[PDB]
Amino acid sequence: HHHHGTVLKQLQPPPRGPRELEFYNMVYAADCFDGVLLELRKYLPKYYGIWSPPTAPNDLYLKLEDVTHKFNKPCIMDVKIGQKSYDPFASSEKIQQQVSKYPLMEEIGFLVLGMRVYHVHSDSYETENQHYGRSLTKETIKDGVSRFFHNGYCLRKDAVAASIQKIEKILQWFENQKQLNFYASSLLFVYEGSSQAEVEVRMIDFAHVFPSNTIDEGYVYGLKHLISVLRSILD
């Protein structure tokens, strides 16, 4: 999610930092017997608690499972999900800056934040940053996403596109019934860029999750368009 066998997720200034920590403590509480939340655990990084560096005791980090472990040369893609990349409490100025960062969000329903794709054609990593995904359009999005699945010179990993789509359909089913709204959240995609399919699809960024009434339509929208783009990549 950020730094550091775990990964250290740096918590953001209040109110964002306390919100993400509340969320994690909520789904991972020991007395949690809410089936929706317990089911949610499947799609998240494992959470091991908080951590401060001895020099900054007021500086808080989440201890998170590093899901790119188990993988030899992992390919990773970060995808923000939804039609808004802002929560309902954002001011007008925030909303304009978020909308102006990617105006097609409203229509495509997801945004590609970054990729790192292992090329066996070169034993090197190809990287895409913020501005690649902020440039894809209705017309280029289908190729844009398929860039992530070009594993070297040979296979364009259909088996990986297929695994991806099954796991995320399962997140589609959870969100098809729930009590929580996710703004500016993302999915993390990992697959194996060589060998030692097997893929990871995890939900990750949680500083803007809110109690809901009720079904999160912006998120089901974005999920649905992403399964669309991934289905047609499979054909």
Author numbering: -14 to -11, 71 to 262, 377 to 415
Which of the paper's sentences describe this entry?
As an essential gene in mammalian development with ubiquitous expression in all eukaryotes, IPMK has important functions at the nexus of many important signaling, metabolic and regulatory pathways, exerting influence through both kinase-dependent and independent roles. The kinase activity of IPMK is a well-characterized node connecting inositol polyphosphate to lipid phosphoinositide signaling, and is critical for AKT activation, Wnt signaling, PLC-mediated IP3/Calcium signaling, nuclear receptor transcriptional activation, mRNA export, and many other roles. All crystal structures of IPK-superfamily kinases have a consensus ATP-grasp fold structurally conserved between family members. However, there are two intrinsically disordered domains in several members of the superfamily: an N-terminal disordered domain and an “internal loop” within the kinase-domain that occurs between S279 and Q373 in human IPMK.
